[PDB]
Amino acid sequence: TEANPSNLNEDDARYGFRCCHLKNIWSAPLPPETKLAEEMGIESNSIDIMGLQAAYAQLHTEQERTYFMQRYRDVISSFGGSTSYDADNRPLLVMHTDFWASGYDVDGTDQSSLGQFSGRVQQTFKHSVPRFFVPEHGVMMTLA
């Protein structure tokens, strides 16, 4: 929520915000507040099986959300609807490319460096954005 670029700390303001590690078992867990048990009210000696029914259904709607519908758009999409980018005021992803950065090793050639190697990563790349129609004044931002 940082109001101004001055509410930003040393590292961030200069280098950009941090992002998430590539998804794996520990870097992409289930939202921490994930329900691990759903309690349902019971009388003292009886249980409304018809209620227990709704109970589950209700839980469902809750999980569906927790798991993958935390954003409004996702909820709507869930019903089989749509949402303009103007609906939840979201940047419009115009283009997204990616690649693996490879390179080569430089060999050591002097008395002590001979047999040593330094890696010089160095990958070329294109990032093309198809003609795009800009409906309203704004900004086209490209980040890496």
Partner: peptide
């Protein structure tokens, strides 16, 4: 025995979904 000159390894990358986190995360 493969001829080529040693290449650095890339991505650890399939079937259906694995990571549910609430929505899209890059």
């Amino acid at each position: 025995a493969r001829p080529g000159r040693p290449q650095p390894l890339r991505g650890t990358k399939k079937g259906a979904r694995l990571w549910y986190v609430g929505g899209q995360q890059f």
